[PDB]
Amino acid sequence: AIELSTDLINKFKDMNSSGNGRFIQATIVDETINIKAIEQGTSDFDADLDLVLKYLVEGEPSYILFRTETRDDITNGYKWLLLAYIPDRAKVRMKMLYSSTKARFRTTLGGSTFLYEIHGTVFSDFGKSGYEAFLRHE
Amino acid sequence: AIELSTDLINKFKDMNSSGNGRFIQATIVDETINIKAIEQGTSDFDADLDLVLKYLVEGEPSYILFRTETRDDITNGYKWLLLAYIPDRAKVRMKMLYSSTKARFRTTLGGSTFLYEIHGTVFSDFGKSGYEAFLRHE
């Protein structure tokens, strides 16, 4: 199966333990999930949700590991959101690979890590508006 | 929670109401944010941004509450910058403490206080050149 890259695990654990950034965008490259981009963000979780919209590329699946304001006692870090942008027009092989590989985050980083896993197919499924819409139906 | 010291609150409110002084450097000691240093500065906001580089200590996290010349109608005072110097070589515990505590300033001093929150990890993220770099990235 596709595994998280060592670099992605290291950067995640660093951001989780240090609280010193907001999100990591990752894509499947070669045999691994690799860092695509890192957003420092701010102390404002709500404002930072909208920064995701600047990193998504229409029609290209990507993951965003988005740090919440809730601490995780188990890891002495934070709870996260797993945002999976898997647009419907992506080829079936790529949609199946991104959909099936979602589970690798909790298995690799720990079951306490993710408060929510949010599957979206359009940019408007994300940002602050998209998050509030997800919460209304979770 | 981590709370601002009474001395820090009072000095901030005095500088906000009088315009007497340019910035306060603050550090977290016990569970309190304390004054580390005060810079009187000048009438030149732009030039005074470089004075921050004289107070940062390489590898030691600190905050700078930096008074702008922009009016805050809400407080009959000024808009401020929250500069957070959180270098990567700081202990994970200290990076987490300084990262997680950023929001305490707006919560305590008032939501209208800060024009911008600027996170940096190296001296070149600050000064006049670092502020211009922040503004250019918007």
Coordinates of C-alpha atoms in Angstrom, one line a residue:
Chain A
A1 CA 0.0 0.0 0.0
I2 CA 1.0 3.7 -0.1
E3 CA 2.7 4.7 3.2
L4 CA 3.4 8.2 4.6
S5 CA 6.9 9.4 3.7
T6 CA 9.4 9.7 6.6
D7 CA 9.7 13.5 5.9
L8 CA 5.8 13.9 6.2
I9 CA 5.7 11.9 9.5
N10 CA 8.7 14.0 10.9
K11 CA 7.1 17.3 9.9
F12 CA 3.7 16.2 11.2
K13 CA 5.2 15.2 14.6
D14 CA 7.1 18.5 14.8
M15 CA 4.0 20.6 14.0
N16 CA 1.9 18.4 16.4
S17 CA 4.4 18.7 19.3
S18 CA 5.5 22.4 18.8
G19 CA 2.0 23.8 17.8
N20 CA 4.0 26.1 15.5
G21 CA 2.1 25.8 12.2
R22 CA -1.5 25.2 11.0
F23 CA -1.5 22.7 8.2
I24 CA 0.4 20.3 5.9
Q25 CA -0.8 19.6 2.3
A26 CA 0.3 16.2 1.1
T27 CA 0.0 14.3 -2.2
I28 CA 0.7 10.7 -3.3
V29 CA 4.1 10.8 -5.2
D30 CA 6.0 7.7 -6.2
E31 CA 5.1 5.1 -3.4
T32 CA 4.6 7.6 -0.6
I33 CA 2.5 10.4 0.8
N34 CA 4.8 13.4 0.5
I35 CA 4.7 17.0 1.8
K36 CA 3.3 19.4 -1.0
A37 CA 3.1 22.5 1.1
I38 CA 3.2 23.8 4.7
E39 CA 1.0 26.8 6.0
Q40 CA 2.2 28.5 9.2
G41 CA -1.3 30.1 9.6
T42 CA -2.1 32.1 12.8
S43 CA -3.6 31.6 16.3
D44 CA -7.1 32.0 14.6
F45 CA -8.4 28.5 13.7
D46 CA -11.6 30.0 12.1
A47 CA -9.7 32.4 9.8
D48 CA -7.1 29.8 8.9
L49 CA -9.7 27.4 7.6
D50 CA -10.1 29.7 4.5
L51 CA -6.3 29.5 3.8
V52 CA -6.9 25.9 2.6
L53 CA -8.7 27.3 -0.5
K54 CA -5.3 28.9 -1.7
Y55 CA -3.6 25.4 -1.7
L56 CA -6.2 23.2 -3.5
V57 CA -5.6 22.6 -7.2
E58 CA -8.9 22.0 -9.1
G59 CA -9.2 18.4 -10.4
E60 CA -6.0 17.3 -8.4
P61 CA -6.7 15.2 -5.3
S62 CA -4.8 16.3 -2.2
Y63 CA -4.8 15.8 1.6
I64 CA -4.7 18.6 4.2
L65 CA -3.7 17.8 7.8
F66 CA -5.3 20.8 9.6
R67 CA -4.4 21.4 13.2
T68 CA -7.3 22.2 15.6
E69 CA -7.1 24.3 18.9
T70 CA -7.9 21.1 21.0
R71 CA -4.9 19.5 22.7
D72 CA -4.4 15.7 22.5
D73 CA -3.2 14.4 25.9
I74 CA -2.1 11.1 24.3
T75 CA 0.6 12.7 22.1
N76 CA 1.1 16.0 24.2
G77 CA 0.1 17.7 20.9
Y78 CA -3.2 18.5 19.2
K79 CA -6.3 17.0 17.6
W80 CA -6.3 17.4 13.7
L81 CA -8.7 17.4 10.8
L82 CA -8.0 15.2 7.8
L83 CA -9.3 17.1 4.8
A84 CA -9.4 14.9 1.7
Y85 CA -10.0 16.8 -1.6
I86 CA -11.0 14.1 -4.0
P87 CA -12.7 15.7 -7.0
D88 CA -15.3 13.6 -8.9
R89 CA -13.6 14.2 -12.3
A90 CA -10.2 12.8 -11.1
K91 CA -9.6 9.4 -12.9
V92 CA -11.1 6.4 -11.1
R93 CA -7.6 4.9 -10.4
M94 CA -6.6 8.2 -8.6
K95 CA -9.9 8.6 -6.7
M96 CA -9.7 5.0 -5.5
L97 CA -6.0 5.4 -4.5
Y98 CA -6.7 8.7 -2.6
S99 CA -10.0 7.3 -1.0
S100 CA -8.4 4.0 0.2
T101 CA -5.1 5.8 1.4
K102 CA -7.1 8.1 3.8
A103 CA -7.1 5.4 6.4
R104 CA -3.2 5.4 6.4
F105 CA -3.2 8.7 8.4
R106 CA -4.9 7.4 11.6
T107 CA -3.1 4.0 11.3
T108 CA 0.3 5.8 11.0
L109 CA 0.0 8.9 13.2
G110 CA -2.4 7.4 15.9
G111 CA -6.1 6.9 16.4
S112 CA -6.3 9.9 18.9
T113 CA -4.9 12.2 16.2
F114 CA -8.0 13.1 14.1
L115 CA -11.1 14.7 15.5
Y116 CA -12.7 14.4 12.0
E117 CA -12.0 13.1 8.5
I118 CA -13.7 15.4 6.0
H119 CA -14.1 14.0 2.4
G120 CA -14.9 16.9 -0.1
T121 CA -15.1 17.0 -3.9
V122 CA -15.2 20.8 -4.5
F123 CA -13.3 23.8 -3.0
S124 CA -16.6 25.0 -1.4
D125 CA -16.6 21.8 0.8
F126 CA -13.7 23.4 2.6
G127 CA -12.9 26.8 4.1
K128 CA -14.8 28.0 7.2
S129 CA -18.2 27.7 5.4
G130 CA -17.5 24.1 4.3
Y131 CA -16.4 23.1 7.9
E132 CA -19.5 24.6 9.5
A133 CA -21.6 22.7 6.8
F134 CA -19.7 19.4 7.7
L135 CA -20.4 20.0 11.5
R136 CA -24.2 20.5 10.9
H137 CA -24.4 16.9 9.4
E138 CA -21.7 14.9 11.3
Chain B
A1 CA -4.3 29.1 31.6
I2 CA -1.3 31.3 30.9
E3 CA -2.3 34.9 31.9
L4 CA -0.8 38.2 31.1
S5 CA 0.9 39.8 34.2
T6 CA -0.8 42.8 35.7
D7 CA 2.4 44.8 35.0
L8 CA 2.2 43.8 31.3
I9 CA -1.5 44.7 31.0
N10 CA -0.9 48.1 32.8
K11 CA 2.1 49.0 30.6
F12 CA 0.3 48.0 27.4
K13 CA -2.8 50.1 28.4
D14 CA -0.6 53.1 29.4
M15 CA 1.3 52.9 26.0
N16 CA -2.0 52.4 24.1
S17 CA -3.7 55.4 25.8
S18 CA -0.6 57.8 25.8
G19 CA 1.5 56.7 22.8
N20 CA 4.5 56.9 25.3
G21 CA 6.8 54.1 24.0
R22 CA 7.0 51.8 21.0
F23 CA 7.1 48.2 22.1
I24 CA 7.1 45.7 24.9
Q25 CA 9.1 42.5 24.7
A26 CA 7.3 39.8 26.8
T27 CA 8.4 36.3 27.9
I28 CA 6.5 33.4 29.6
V29 CA 7.8 32.8 33.2
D30 CA 5.9 30.4 35.5
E31 CA 2.4 30.6 34.0
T32 CA 2.5 34.4 33.5
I33 CA 3.4 36.6 30.5
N34 CA 5.9 39.1 31.9
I35 CA 7.7 42.2 30.6
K36 CA 11.2 41.4 29.5
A37 CA 12.0 44.8 28.0
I38 CA 10.5 48.1 26.9
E39 CA 11.6 50.2 23.9
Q40 CA 10.7 53.9 24.0
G41 CA 11.4 54.1 20.2
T42 CA 10.9 57.3 18.2
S43 CA 8.1 59.1 16.1
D44 CA 9.2 56.9 13.1
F45 CA 7.2 53.6 13.2
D46 CA 9.2 52.2 10.1
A47 CA 12.7 52.9 11.6
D48 CA 11.5 51.5 15.0
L49 CA 10.7 48.1 13.5
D50 CA 14.5 47.5 13.2
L51 CA 14.9 48.2 17.0
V52 CA 13.3 44.7 17.6
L53 CA 16.5 43.1 16.2
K54 CA 18.4 44.6 19.2
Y55 CA 16.1 42.8 21.7
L56 CA 15.6 39.3 20.2
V57 CA 17.9 36.6 21.6
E58 CA 18.8 34.0 19.0
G59 CA 17.2 30.6 20.0
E60 CA 15.0 32.1 22.8
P61 CA 11.3 32.6 22.0
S62 CA 9.8 36.0 22.9
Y63 CA 6.8 38.2 22.0
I64 CA 6.9 41.8 20.8
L65 CA 3.8 44.0 21.3
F66 CA 4.6 46.7 18.7
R67 CA 2.6 49.9 18.7
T68 CA 1.8 51.2 15.2
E69 CA 0.8 54.9 14.4
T70 CA -2.6 53.6 13.1
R71 CA -5.6 54.7 15.3
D72 CA -7.9 52.1 17.0
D73 CA -11.2 54.0 17.3
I74 CA -12.5 51.2 19.7
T75 CA -9.9 52.0 22.4
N76 CA -9.1 55.7 21.5
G77 CA -5.6 54.2 21.1
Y78 CA -3.5 52.4 18.5
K79 CA -3.4 49.2 16.4
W80 CA -0.6 46.9 17.4
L81 CA 1.5 44.1 15.9
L82 CA 1.9 40.8 17.8
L83 CA 5.4 39.6 16.8
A84 CA 6.1 36.1 17.9
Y85 CA 9.7 35.0 17.6
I86 CA 9.6 31.2 17.9
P87 CA 12.9 29.8 16.6
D88 CA 13.0 26.1 15.5
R89 CA 16.0 25.3 17.9
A90 CA 13.9 26.2 21.0
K91 CA 12.8 23.1 23.0
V92 CA 9.5 21.6 21.7
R93 CA 7.9 22.5 25.2
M94 CA 8.9 26.2 24.7
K95 CA 7.7 26.3 21.1
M96 CA 4.3 24.8 22.2
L97 CA 4.0 27.2 25.1
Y98 CA 4.7 30.3 22.9
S99 CA 2.6 29.0 20.0
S100 CA -0.5 28.1 22.1
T101 CA -0.3 31.3 24.2
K102 CA -0.5 33.7 21.1
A103 CA -4.3 34.0 21.3
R104 CA -4.2 35.2 25.0
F105 CA -3.1 38.7 23.9
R106 CA -6.3 39.5 21.9
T107 CA -8.5 37.7 24.5
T108 CA -7.0 39.8 27.4
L109 CA -6.3 43.2 25.7
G110 CA -9.3 43.3 23.3
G111 CA -10.1 41.9 19.8
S112 CA -9.5 45.3 18.1
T113 CA -5.9 45.6 19.4
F114 CA -3.9 43.8 16.8
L115 CA -3.7 44.8 13.1
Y116 CA -1.5 41.7 12.4
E117 CA 0.0 38.7 14.2
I118 CA 3.4 37.9 12.7
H119 CA 5.1 34.6 13.4
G120 CA 8.8 34.3 12.6
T121 CA 11.6 31.8 13.3
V122 CA 14.7 33.9 12.3
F123 CA 15.7 37.5 12.9
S124 CA 15.2 38.3 9.2
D125 CA 11.5 37.6 9.6
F126 CA 11.4 40.9 11.7
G127 CA 12.8 44.4 11.3
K128 CA 11.5 46.8 8.7
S129 CA 12.5 44.3 5.9
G130 CA 10.6 41.5 7.6
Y131 CA 7.5 43.6 8.0
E132 CA 7.6 44.6 4.3
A133 CA 8.0 40.8 3.5
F134 CA 5.0 40.0 5.7
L135 CA 2.9 42.8 4.0
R136 CA 3.9 41.6 0.5
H137 CA 2.7 38.1 1.3
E138 CA -0.5 39.8 2.6

